[PDB]
């Protein structure tokens, strides 16, 4: 029954409209749901705009008037120029003729602010179409009307505010360059009259509503107006004094002054410098006398969250940091300005204690700016010694676990502050440690934060000072753990001890007996059943090793063997209690040390001894699983194999090229294992169906294949002897994986195969051209069929597929030349298929492959394959690129679509395409490719966007082809085209902008 108003044959039953509108806004359930759908079909009716006359005049529901203003807004925005001219006067008179009335009835002027604001915006949409060419007297008549009614004078401030935003703040993407410039110039030419009305309103008071709405409009003006309007009038003193006193105007005034601190002014006028000092002195005085003194506990205020205190403290931090980053030098030399400078920073100190992550980052950025300057600029740091001293404590007490981005910022500021005063930093940290020991501030969170702070300043003190500092800290931490009761407490303190120790490798390097003691403590902690201790001991072990590895590989004075040998000997008992992933980290740590041994025979010996346990377990399994493949039907056997390979991956990760001898020990049997596993998976899918791929049994089997491919990829990516990779590794690898991939059902194909192949082609692809051909033959057509029915299925295969085609196109392009013409056509189809993905990982590769393929064809010169390529696929690539540029669903790829299009267009306007791109029947002989390209593009655009005039398409194409050697201008012309297709009657001269 609610679907009656959708019938435009009758007249609009406004009373029925206000019912369905209220059913939508105030109702619920199914009665609200379809009423919403009826309002969608009504609003989206192409003729609903002419019924907005009745709704805005007859309805009593303000939401209904709002909805119809939207219907109007779509009309003004997209079809205004198509209207009969008298309709444009009707709408324009109507809209001016309602705002006139809503401002006179004080009831509706304070009851329906949404509706008047929505009407103001509708008016601004008309001004963007008609003003000032067909409305030269808008601004003068706006000023005159303001003097009659306070309600209209305030609303005119709302109109000007929105106008400034539409023209200067939100135009770049929503209008053409030409139309934006026209509007900016028009506002600029008449701002003198706008400013006078704005200034006199602010000086003569007195309506708070009128004043605030004027200040809100001033905020927008400050984005673009010239500085003389601010510094050559008295407006700075009004903002920094009068309007800072009342809380109604306080927030907006503070935002205006923040924008003032960013104005473009001249830095050589000492008068302007004093005005910049003056408004800051006034603003800080008003804050100290009307809001809170510099000693106030801003942390407590912010946490109480009264009124708008949080937003005010946020704006104050923004104002102080913005001003001081630009102007603090104005306050640093004059002795009379020293208290102002230090009070402003003292407010920032108090602001920095607030418990508000995002606000802290804002102040932390300023502090970074300050302390970096005190570190490099002469004679500056003595001014801020007491500011800096407090900042040290604020940063130490708010240190986060090492967001990682925030920790880096805190560490950088704290390191600067330690250079500025090493002695003060040590005293603060030792004192905080004492308050941890006496228990006044003892807490798990508190001791961890301090350890992070202590660890963050590593390498900033002299080695001797560092030595006695570290010793004091470890000793006190050791005493703190000694006095604490319970495993929970003593695990936290022991972890912190390890964290700090791990953070100071310069100290560990110079004290081997201490370093040995640490490592043996870690090995002891690897038997600790308490949660997290084993993880901590492993993470500390590998961290210390990465920094002190040289001291494990050499034979230390006082001993018989490098400590690495001592670690390898006891490796079974050291790791016996660890989880497999922890054992893999341990082995990786050992691999780091071993790679430091540059005697080949000694390094290979360490490698083979480190690999003794996994090699023995490997040899037995390869024995018993070969005789005979039933043991792979054991879950326990599958885990042991996966864990053996992961160990090799871990060690290969840290050893790279050095890993080759160990790879050769297992390589040939590993690939055989890969085959055996591959058969068992295929068998299980045959016996149980596709669901077998979801079973634990098969997932454990595919894990083995995956780890094998990752091991091979890991070595080849880091190998140095490429010759051995080609002649020893690549061929057995391809025989083991290509055919097995091609001949499995889609659900049993591991996308890791494509990723492994990508690595091989990346590293040695230039050396195995028949290998690359075999890769394409085995994976191309079958993978393409998995992914060319939708954009959803097989996400990994999709990403790896185009990664693989990208590298093959880069490094062995000849493989695509050897494809049969039908297969080369699927290659082109597949590239364009990647254009249409909203997946960024597919789309960017698809566009890059296209660009790189065009370049590969260009480099071939004037030969039959390059000639046939343009005849077959040039306009396909121009058409498909244009399609994604203009469909509004691939905006993330605009830049690379533009680049590719310009390459395609420039090929023709330079005459590198030797063939004619046309059939010699459809166009006269001798016709250039440039003339045919314009004709083709004009027809394609005329059918794809029929609402455009021929003139628009021709002017657009003319500017586009002329600009195909200037990416920034070319992209500007594309953006202008993307705006004009959104509406009717776009000005074709707009394309002469550049």
């Amino acid at each position: 029954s609610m679907e009656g108003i959708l019938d435009f044959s009758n007249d609009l039953d406004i009373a029925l409209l206000d019912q369905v509108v209220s059913t939508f806004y105030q109702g619920s359930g199914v009665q609200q749901k379809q009423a919403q759908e009826i309002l969608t079909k009504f609003q989206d009716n192409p003729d609903a705009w002419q019924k907005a006359d009745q709704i805005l005049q007859f309805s009593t529901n303000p939401q209904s008037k709002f909805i119809a203003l939207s219907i109007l807004d779509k009309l003004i925005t997209r079809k205004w120029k198509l209207l009969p001219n008298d309709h444009r006067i009707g709408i324009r008179n109507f809209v001016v003729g309602m705002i006139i009335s809503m401002c006179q009835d004080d009831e509706v002027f304070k009851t329906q602010k949404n509706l008047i604001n929505k009407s103001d915006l509708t008016l601004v949409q008309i001004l963007k179409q008609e003003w000032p060419q067909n409305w030269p007297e808008f601004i003068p008549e706006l000023i005159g009307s303001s003097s009659s009614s306070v309600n209209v004078c305030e609303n005119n401030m709302i109109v000007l505010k929105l106008l400034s935003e539409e023209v200067f703040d939100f135009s770049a993407e929503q209008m053409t360059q030409a139309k934006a410039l026209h509007l900016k110039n028009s506002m600029s030419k008449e701002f003198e009259q706008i400013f006078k009305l704005c200034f006199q309103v602010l000086e003569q008071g007195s309506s708070s509503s009128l004043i605030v709405a004027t200040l809100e409009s001033l905020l927008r003006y400050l984005h673009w107006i010239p500085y003389r309007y601010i510094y050559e009038t008295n407006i700075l003193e009004l903002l920094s004094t009068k309007f800072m006193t009342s809380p109604d105007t306080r927030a907006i005034t503070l935002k205006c002054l923040t924008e003032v601190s960013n104005l473009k002014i001249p830095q050589d006028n000492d008068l302007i410098k004093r005005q910049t000092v003056l408004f800051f002195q006034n603003t800080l005085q008003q804050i100290a006398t009307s809001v809170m003194p510099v000693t106030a506990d801003l942390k407590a205020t912010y946490a109480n969250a009264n009124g708008n205190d949080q937003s005010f403290l946020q704006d104050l931090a923004m104002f102080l940091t913005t001003y001081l980053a630009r102007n603090r030098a104005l306050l640093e030399s004059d002795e009379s300005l020293r208290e102002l400078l230090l009070n402003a920073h003292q407010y920032l100190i108090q602001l920095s204690k607030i418990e508000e992550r995002e606000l802290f980052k804002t102040t932390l950025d300023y502090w970074h700016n300050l302390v970096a300057d005190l570190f490099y600029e002469p004679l500056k740091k003595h001014i801020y010694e007491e500011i800096c001293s407090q900042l040290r404590l604020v940063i130490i007490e708010n240190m986060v676990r090492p967001t990682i981005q925030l920790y880096k910022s805190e560490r950088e500021v704290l390191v600067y502050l330690t250079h500025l005063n090493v002695i003060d930093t040590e005293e603060i940290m030792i004192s905080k440690l004492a308050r941890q020991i006496d228990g006044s501030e003892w807490s798990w969170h508190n001791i961890n934060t301090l350890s992070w702070a202590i660890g963050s300043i590593s390498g900033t003190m002299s080695e001797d000072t560092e030595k006695r500092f570290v010793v004091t800290v470890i000793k006190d931490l050791l005493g703190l753990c000694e006095q604490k009761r319970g495993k929970d407490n003593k695990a936290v303190v022991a972890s912190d001890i390890m964290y700090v120790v791990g953070q100071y490798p310069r100290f560990l390097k110079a004290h081997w007996n201490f370093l040995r003691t640490v490592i043996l403590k870690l090995f002891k902690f690897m038997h600790e059943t308490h949660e997290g201790v084993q993880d901590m001991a492993c993470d500390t072990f590998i961290k210390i090793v990465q920094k002190c590895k040289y001291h494990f590989v050499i034979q230390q004075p006082r001993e018989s063997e490098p400590f690495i040998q001592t670690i390898i000997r006891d490796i079974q008992k050291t790791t016996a209690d660890l989880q497999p992933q922890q054992v893999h980290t341990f082995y990786k740590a050992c691999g780091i040390i071993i790679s430091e041994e540059r005697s080949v025979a000694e390094r290979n010996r360490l490698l083979s001894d480190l690999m003794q346990l996994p090699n023995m377990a490997w040899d037995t399994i390869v024995e018993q699983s070969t005789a005979n493949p039933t043991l792979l039907l054991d879950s326990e056997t599958v885990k042991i194999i996966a864990n053996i390979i992961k160990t090799n991956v871990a060690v290969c990760t840290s050893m790279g090229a050095d890993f080759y001898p160990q790879l050769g020990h297992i390589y040939y049997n590993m690939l055989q294992l890969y085959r055996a596993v591959s058969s068992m998976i295929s068998a299980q899918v045959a016996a149980e169906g596709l669901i077998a791929t979801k079973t634990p049994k098969v997932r454990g089997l595919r894990t083995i294949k995956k780890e094998i491919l990752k091991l091979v990829e890991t070595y080849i990516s880091k190998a140095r002897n490429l010759d051995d990779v080609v002649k020893v590794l690549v061929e057995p690898l391809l025989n083991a994986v290509l055919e097995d991939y091609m001949n499995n059902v889609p659900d049993a194909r591991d996308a890791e195969v494509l990723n492994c192949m990508t690595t091989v082609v990346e590293k040695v692809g230039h050396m195995i051209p028949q290998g690359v051909i075999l890769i394409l033959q085995s994976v191309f057509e079958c993978t393409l069929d998995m992914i060319n029915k939708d954009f959803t299925e097989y996400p990994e295969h999709r990403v790896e597929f185009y990664k693989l085609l990208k590298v093959i196109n880069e490094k062995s392009f000849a493989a695509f030349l050897e494809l049969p013409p039908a297969a080369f056509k699927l290659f082109v189809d597949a590239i364009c298929w990647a254009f249409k993905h909203n997946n960024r990982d597919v789309e960017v590769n698809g566009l890059q492959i296209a660009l790189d393929l065009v370049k590969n064809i260009e480099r071939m010169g004037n030969v039959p394959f390059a000639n046939e390529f343009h005849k077959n696929y040039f306009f396909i690539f121009v058409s498909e690129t244009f399609f994604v540029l203009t469909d509004s669903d691939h905006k993330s790829g605009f830049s690379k679509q533009a680049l590719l299009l310009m390459k395609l267009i420039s090929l023709v306007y330079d005459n590198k395409i030797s063939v004619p791109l046309y059939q010699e029947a459809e166009v006269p002989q001798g016709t250039s490719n440039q003339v045919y390209l314009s004709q083709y593009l004009a027809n394609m655009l005329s059918n794809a966007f029929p609402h455009l005039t021929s003139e628009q398409i021709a002017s657009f194409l003319s500017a586009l082809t002329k600009q195909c050697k200037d990416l920034v201008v070319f992209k500007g012309t594309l953006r202008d085209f993307l705006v004009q297709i959104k509406e009717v009657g776009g000005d074709p001269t707009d394309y002469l902008f550049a």
Binding site: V471, L478, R485, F514
Partner: peptide
């Protein structure tokens, strides 16, 4: 005080 620090750490254990 480096030799004392070494022994103090060797004595560190989690259990009472």
């Amino acid at each position: 005080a480096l030799e004392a620090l070494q022994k103090k750490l060797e004595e560190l254990e989690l259990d009472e």
